[PDB]
Amino acid sequence: PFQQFGRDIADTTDAVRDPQTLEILDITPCSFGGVSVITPGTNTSNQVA
Amino acid sequence: NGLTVLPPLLTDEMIAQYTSALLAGTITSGWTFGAGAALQIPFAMQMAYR
Ligand SMILES: *[C@@H]1O[C@H](CO)[C@@H](O)[C@H](O)[C@H]1NC(C)=O
């Protein structure tokens, strides 16, 4: 009843109580990752994925 | 938190096919699949060899 937010194993906040209702929301971080370019040799084609 | 984990190139299912292949070569053909094509030999005679 008194708890306002929750944490993952290593410090990071992973859930919050909405202060107006009582709902508990999980937080997922922004989607992110490496852009990687898959290519034949430029000697044979210029199409890439 | 800016950290990313990348998958292995070979899945656990693909590794389990290679460990089945090495095992099925070893059972049916002794060491011969390490020298060339697998040559079948009866398993009692492969142990008689070993
Ligand atoms: C806050 O107000 C809303 C209506 O706007 C109400 O539905 C909600 O139960 C209230 N929560 C409390 C008691 O803080």
From Swiss-Prot, chain A:
The lineage of its organism: Viruses, Riboviria, Orthornavirae, Pisuviricota, Pisoniviricetes. This is Spike protein S1. Attaches the virion to the cell membrane by interacting with host receptor, initiating the infection. The major receptor is host ACE2. When S2/S2' has been cleaved, binding to the receptor triggers direct fusion at the cell membrane. When S2/S2' has not been cleaved, binding to the receptor results in internalization of the virus by endocytosis using host TFRC and GRM2 and leading to fusion of the virion membrane with the host endosomal membrane. Alternatively, may use NRP1/NRP2 and integrin as entry receptors. Binds to host ACE2. RBD also interacts with the N-linked glycan on 'Asn-90' of ACE2. Cleavage of S generates a polybasic C-terminal sequence on S1 that binds to host Neuropilin-1 (NRP1) and Neuropilin-2 (NRP2) receptors. Interacts with host integrin alpha-5/beta-1 (ITGA5:ITGB1) and with ACE2 in complex with integrin alpha-5/beta-1 (ITGA5:ITGB1). May interact via cytoplasmic c-terminus with M protein. May interact (via N-terminus) with host bilirubin and biliverdin, thereby preventing antibody binding to the SARS-CoV-2 spike NTD via an allosteric mechanism. The chain holds residues 561 to 609 of 1273 of the full protein. It comes from Severe acute respiratory syndrome coronavirus 2 (2019-nCoV). Glycans are attached at N43.
